[PDB]
């Protein structure tokens, strides 16, 4: 059981840097690249094999490729703390940026970087033995993560196809944005994020900012706390493969229990308890309130209002001190509650899974260490809501032919902007049909 992780773009590799720090701290791996022990209480030995492949003797090298067009953050990583940890070739760096340009990323510099990326991933997969699947980390607002992200996804689908591809994507928030042409970029990326990813999990930044303001009461959060929380979420959802527990689920369970139709795969994520060191020692942590907080929309990583929508199906990973008794009690309470409502074409809409190892804390982080935690991943129509909110501001700019000459200059035809608009409209129509 092994899963590989690719990161594309700036945000992608920063989330991955955070994830890999967390993974090393979980598995007891020094930044040198060697585990100085065999105690490994965990769930068992050979747990690391799912992320770190043991090489040579007493040496563990991660199953990942960071890749980027601008060399700056790649060589910051190269010069930082985990030099001796990543393989020198695993980090891949272009020479110039894609610069917030989907066309520049998809047709100008993809055509030189993606072949190298693919023939590196091929030997990674070949070294691998029981590959579960790929997990991609990218941001759709930028140029790299958008254009050559989609290029790499197309090429992965044509190479392998039947293997799972978990895309934890960063979407643009409704009002928060650090770009201008990101609506164009998001639409051109979703055109292929629809029919190439199998399970796509959105993360906005405004929702995480609100979370960090309210719960963790950090008044001045940077991207580091966002990345640490995203790494925690990823770790919680892969703990089931990593350690053993009362009721485990692999990667192949999300595609089975959360994707009722091959086109409706866009998942709200959530996490609880997001709690600071003072609020830990003052709130009592039981399973009931954390299952209630996982659904209260003040604790979701995507800014949307599920009271406007209806849940298709949800998945609940539990970590730590959990027996099935209280988790069944809490799920029955939730199902009987009426402030949230399920779609009638799905009477039983929950998939629970439990793992015994509690979540770990990175020193310097702002999350306390807790008895237990919950990672919620649902499916609803807040996503079609989000898509329309985004389509509106895309069409606003496209009515006046703004910024179009860049893309047309970089080899993207004007017609593309019409068929991606139509694709998004068809996706909206499908969502509205299915919700009834």
């Amino acid at each position: 059981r092994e899963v590989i992780s690719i990161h594309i773009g700036q945000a992608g590799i920063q989330v991955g840097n955070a994830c890999w720090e967390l993974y090393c701290l979980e598995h007891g791996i020094q930044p040198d690249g060697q585990m100085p022990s065999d105690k490994t209480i965990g769930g068992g030995d050979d747990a690391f094999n799912t992320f770190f492949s043991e090489t040579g003797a007493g040496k563990h090298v991660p199953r990942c490729i960071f890749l980027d067009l601008e060399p700056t953050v790649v060589d910051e990583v190269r010069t930082g703390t985990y030099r001796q940890l990543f393989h020198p070739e695993q980090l891949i760096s272009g020479k110039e940026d894609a610069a917030n340009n989907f066309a520049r990323g998809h047709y100008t510099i993809g055509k030189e970087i993606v072949d190298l990326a693919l023939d590196r991933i091929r030997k990674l997969a070949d070294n691998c033995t029981g590959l579960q699947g790929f997990l991609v980390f990218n941001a759709v607002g930028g140029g790299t993560g958008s254009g050559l992200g989609s290029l790499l996804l197309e090429r992965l689908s044509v190479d392998y196809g039947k293997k799972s591809k978990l895309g934890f994507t960063v979407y643009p928030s409704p009002q928060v944005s650090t770009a201008v042409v990101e609506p164009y970029n998001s639409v051109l990326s979703t055109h292929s994020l629809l029919e190439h990813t199998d399970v796509a999990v959105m993360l906005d930044n405004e929702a995480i900012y609100d979370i960090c303001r309210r719960s963790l009461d950090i008044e001045r959060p940077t991207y580091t706390n966002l990345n640490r929380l995203i790494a925690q979420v990823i770790s919680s959802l892969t703990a089931s493969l990593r350690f053993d527990g009362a009721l485990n689920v692999d990667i192949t369970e999300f595609q089975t229990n959360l994707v009722p139709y091959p086109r409706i795969h866009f998942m709200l994520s959530s996490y609880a308890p997001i709690i600071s060191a003072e609020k830990a020692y003052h709130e009592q942590l039981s399973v009931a309130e954390i299952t209630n907080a996982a659904f209260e929309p003040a604790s979701m990583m995507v800014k949307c209002d599920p009271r406007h929508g209806k849940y298709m199906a949800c998945c609940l990973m539990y970590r730590g001190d959990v027996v099935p008794k209280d988790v069944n009690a809490s799920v029955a309470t939730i199902k009987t509650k009426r402030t949230i409502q399920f779609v009638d074409w799905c009477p039983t809409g929950f998939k629970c899974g439990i793992n015994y190892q509690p979540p770990t804390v990175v020193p310097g982080g702002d999350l306390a260490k807790v008895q237990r935690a919950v990672c919620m991943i649902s499916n609803s129509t807040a996503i079609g809501e989000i898509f329309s909110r985004l389509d509106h501001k895309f069409d606003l700019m496209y009515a006046k032919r703004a910024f179009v000459h860049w893309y047309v200059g970089e080899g993207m035809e004007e017609g593309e902007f019409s068929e991606a608009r139509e694709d998004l409209a068809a996706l909206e129509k499908d969502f509205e049909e299915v919700g009834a």
Partner: peptide, 19 residues
Amino acid sequence: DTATKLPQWVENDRKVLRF
């Protein structure tokens, strides 16, 4: 500046005890 623990096969390449 911390030394790493090499594999036994590369840390004792050509060392041979001789009696």
